[PDB]
Design a protein around this nucleic acid. Structure first.
Lengths: 91, 97, 113, 123, 57, 98, 229, 229
RNA sequence: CCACAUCCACCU
């Protein structure tokens, strides 16, 4: 499978919410680019033939490994949505 | 086995252990020499086989023979109808080529 | 596997019967998987300190995987077959911990579906 | 024009020329625009025969509105592989799953190895 | 025009991607299953034996 | 043999005689009456389903033949016998997982 | 050299011609009969280089599904018969040879009809090739190459002529190998192994040379463990 | 060249102490992974030299299935606990070593409690042999030889004293070995082999040393075909 | 261009 699906299910009330969180994190990682990650310093995905898993081979694994750590928060309404949603599309 | 003995060969040790294991399985009557034990095993249609990858014989006798095997009609069915972009229909735009 | 009992199965009482039945197994008096009263001569002849020793002896063709034998597991002496011990080890290595793997299996019966 | 080498004669590909998918078979020009028969994606073999029927009918009849037609026969030598399926006269269907080398297959006490291995559980 | 670099690029593309395998009669929910593709040489699709019962295949 | 004979796919000698010429595409046979007849062969004929129909010569130049004797093989005949498949050494045992 | 060489196999050979040869290796300590027989058999059946027909050109035909007038056999049958041809190279440096064959008239064209070459021998001159009835001309060239293993016709893709047709190659001189381990008795130890391996080859390579090549390949592969990192 | 020479299979080593070793050979040509795995595994499991406790004699023991007063463990438990004792000789000259054990009083008796011997060493001093409840009379001795493979106690019957009891001998230092060949892939073709080999050893010799000895034995046995007769 | 009709097959 993928690293720690059991604790990923444990830290969320429903699997569908986990899917929404991981996919939204992946979309952010794409459209921002991979700069705003919380796993930059040492713990990063390791590619086989080179270190190609530095930049962008597959972002779902990035989002999952990023959510495995405790630097992420998710909720129904945690931040004023209007400002960030208007800054999401107009930049 | 006459052809086998023509060159001056007896019974392999692997065959000996296979025969004793089959004796424990009741395939061959006990108290008999490997000659007639292997003959009785041949009567069953089973002969000793060697793995080939490891060299050790396959535990227990293996049934082998000649079979008439034929290749069936082989049309595009196996061919991969894998497309990414192709023709679309007129009424609806669902793609069919 | 069990085949046949050909001699006096009485073994619990006589402490001198061990040598007599070992001699009987030396001849064709009793098979290794004999249906004795308490124990078969296979359990008497071979005792293994660790499962590794039992599997190594199997690799040498001395005993088959379908042979009753006494093996000293992590905490107990079990009269089982090297095949069952190997299956238990397979389960114990597939998962990390071995105590949980030991407690979630039943090594006293054939592995039916 | 580089791929025109196989198209030897006037419009028809030469006999005995191997053709891969995407290669020209018959060159037809419409009103000029290139509408030529090519080998469809997939597989192609060896051209063996070509037949041409024109309006100069000896005894042939054609669909009205069609001035001529050309048919090309391409032959290939299919060999047994994983995709194919084999069966016996007793209904034991099967699909080839792996082609093992000669060295690692089960063999008799003699040097002769077995050719095919069948799963007993289907019996 | 196929080249080994093209195959390496294709392997790099599908490192994390998954594909949905389906059997023609989809009787229950397990008739659609996601898998991690592995490039193989041949014409047939290699299927794990343990899912031979989830599909009726 | 009955299947290959009744299905008009092979060639048989209509009368006692001796074969005159044998080629890859025709066979000229002179019968006992002195009449010689040429039998052509559909060397590589595409079938309805896309297979190949072949008549392979099975006689040699100057070979005596009997009435109804085989002359050329059918598409799937070895020697006047229905042969569609192969005879192979089969072992009935389970391999690894293949 | 007694407990480790005399209670260890002496090596005897019993070969007839260059087609069949037994090698007896006696005695072995218990368990080493298979340990030596199996890898040797696998290498002999797997990676013994040899020679096989690579390409065929016919002066008349233009594809492999045609026929030559005056010839009983089809082009496919000619190719199939040519697959069984075994050619022995007398010069180790020689790689590719092109044999020529001219045939006319009512002739049963066998393998002996090929034009002689300086360092090429035909080990099966009696191999049937074709049958010419009358007025039939068979002008052919066969390009034979030295290789290893089995290669499909399209994989190598040898094209010296436009009309040449590639053929499959079976570069294995070894027809088959069968090793058997038997029980032999010594004074100190009653149960010892005697490993006798029988090799049937096609005559291109004598079994002794095939065994030497297999041993050398196995040794050079074992050398690959010498350098760790 | 990456076809055969530049792909001199990388031999990666992963040693977790002196007990566990993984060796990966990659990449290897088709069919050679098994051809290298089987002989090496057989050599490791059969012919690696080592030492084991051949026999034991205790003063008050008359039968092997009796109970010793003053010790809760029976004779069977004592010999089974003695089975896993690993001892290394310091020089090649040693063939047999007799090691005695004096023990009394309510104390745990372990391998370290054995009387020191100058020319032998014990890799597991803390191996708990037995327990004494109250003044247990523990007068024991063990004879240890050097050998190869696994020797059942029945057939060898090595004896020092009249009442001495044979012990099954496990001479092979390696506990077990497991080789897996899995289909790796190169840039252009897939039909290659990756050979992983996992070795678990008692601790007398590191897995690298055992593998080197195995390949050396295989090479020296291969060198036996040089001289024919 | 692939529409529809008819027929023959393959996998459940």
């Amino acid at each position: 499978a993928e690293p720690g699906i059991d604790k990923l299910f444990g830290m969320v009330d429903s699997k569908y919410r986990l899917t929404v969180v991981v996919a939204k994190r992946a979309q952010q990682l794409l459209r921002h680019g991979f700069k705003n990650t919380v796993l930059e310093p040492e713990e990063r995905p390791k590619m086989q033939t080179l270190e190609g898993l530095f930049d962008d081979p597959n972002a779902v694994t990035w989002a999952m490994k990023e959510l495995l750590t405790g630097r992420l928060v998710f909720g129904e309404n945690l931040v004023p949505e209007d400002r960030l949603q208007k800054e999401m599309e107009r930049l | 086995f006459g052809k086998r003995k023509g060159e001056g060969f007896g019974v392999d040790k692997r065959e000996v252990e296979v025969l004793r294991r089959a004796e424990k399985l009741g395939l061959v009557t006990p108290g008999k020499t490997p000659e007639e034990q292997l003959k009785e095993l041949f009567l069953q249609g089973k002969v000793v086989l060697y793995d080939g990858r490891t060299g050790e014989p396959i535990e227990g006798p293996i049934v082998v023979g000649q079979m008439f095997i034929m290749k069936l009609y082989h049309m595009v069915e196996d061919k991969m109808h894998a497309r990414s972009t192709g023709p679309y229909s007129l009424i609806t735009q669902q793609p069919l080529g | 596997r069990k085949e046949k009992k050909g001699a006096g199965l009485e073994f619990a009482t006589p402490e001198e019967a061990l040598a007599a039945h070992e001699r009987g197994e030396v001849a064709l008096n009793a098979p290794i998987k004999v249906a004795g009263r308490e124990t078969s001569v296979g359990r008497l002849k071979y005792v293994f300190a660790n499962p590794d020793e039992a599997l190594l002896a199997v690799a040498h063709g001395i005993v088959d995987l379908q042979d009753v034998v006494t093996v000293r597991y992590m905490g107990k002496r079990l009269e089982t077959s090297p095949g069952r011990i190997l299956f238990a080890r397979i389960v114990a290595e597939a998962v990390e911990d071995e105590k949980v793997a030991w407690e979630l299996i039943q090594l006293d019966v054939p592995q039916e579906k | 024009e580089a791929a025109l080498r196989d198209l030897d004669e006037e419009g028809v590909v030469r006999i005995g020329a191997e053709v891969k998918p995407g290669d020209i078979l018959v060159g037809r020009t419409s009103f000029v625009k290139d509408t030529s028969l090519r080998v469809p994606p997939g597989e192609g073999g060896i051209v063996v025969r070509t037949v041409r029927l024109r309006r100069g009918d000896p005894g042939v009849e054609l669909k009205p509105g069609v001035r001529e037609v050309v048919r090309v026969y391409v032959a290939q030598k299919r060999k047994l592989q994983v995709g194919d399926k084999l069966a016996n006269r007793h209904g034991n269907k099967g699909v080839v799953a792996k082609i093992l080398p000669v060295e690692d297959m089960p063999h008799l006490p003699d040097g002769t190895p077995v050719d095919v291995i069948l799963n007993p559980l289907g019996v | 025009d196929i080249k080994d670099e093209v195959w390496d690029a294709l392997e790099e593309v599908i490192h994390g991607k998954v594909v949905l395998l389906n059997r023609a009669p989809t009787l229950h929910r397990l008739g659609i299953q996601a898998f991690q593709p592995v490039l193989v040489e041949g014409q047939s699709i290699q299927l794990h034996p343990l899912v031979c019962e989830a599909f009726n295949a | 043999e009955r299947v290959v004979r009744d299905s008009l796919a092979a060639l048989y000698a209509e009368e006692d005689g001796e074969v005159a010429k044998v080629d890859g595409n025709r066979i000229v046979v002179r019968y006992e009456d002195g009449r010689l007849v040429e039998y052509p062969l559909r060397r590589f004929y595409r079938s309805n389903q896309g297979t190949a129909l072949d008549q392979r010569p099975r006689v040699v130049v100057g070979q005596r033949v009997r009435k109804g004797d085989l002359l050329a093989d059918g598409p799937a005949s070895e020697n006047g016998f229905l042969a569609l498949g192969q005879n192979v050494l089969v072992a009935i045992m389970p391999f690894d997982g293949y | 050299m007694l407990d480790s060489k005399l209670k260890a196999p002496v090596f005897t050979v019993r070969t007839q011609g260059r087609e069949y040869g037994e090698f007896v290796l006696e005695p072995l300590e218990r368990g080493f009969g298979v340990t030596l027989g199996n890898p040797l058999r696998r290498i002999l059946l797997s990676s013994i280089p040899g020679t096989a027909v690579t390409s065929v050109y016919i002066e008349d035909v233009l594809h492999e599904f045609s026929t030559i007038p005056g010839v009983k056999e089809d082009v496919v049958e000619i190719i199939l018969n040519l697959k069984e041809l075994v050619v022995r190279f007398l010069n180790p440096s020689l790689q590719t040879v092109t044999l020529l064959l001219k045939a006319e008239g009512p002739k049963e064209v066998k393998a002996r009809d090929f034009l002689p070459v300086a360092d090429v021998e035909i080990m099966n001159p009696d191999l049937h090739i074709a049958t010419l009835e009358e007025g039939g001309r068979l002008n052919m060239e066969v390009r034979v190459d030295r290789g290893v293993g089995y290669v499909p016709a399209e994989k190598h893709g040898i094209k010296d002529r436009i009309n040449a047709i590639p053929v499959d190659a079976v570069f294995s001189p070894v027809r088959r190998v069968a090793f058997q381990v038997e029980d032999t008795r010594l004074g100190q130890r009653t149960d010892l192994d005697k490993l006798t391996l029988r090799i049937w080859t096609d005559g291109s390579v004598t079994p002794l040379e095939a065994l030497n090549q297999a041993v050398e390949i196995l040794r050079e592969h074992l050398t690959y463990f010498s350098n760790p990192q």
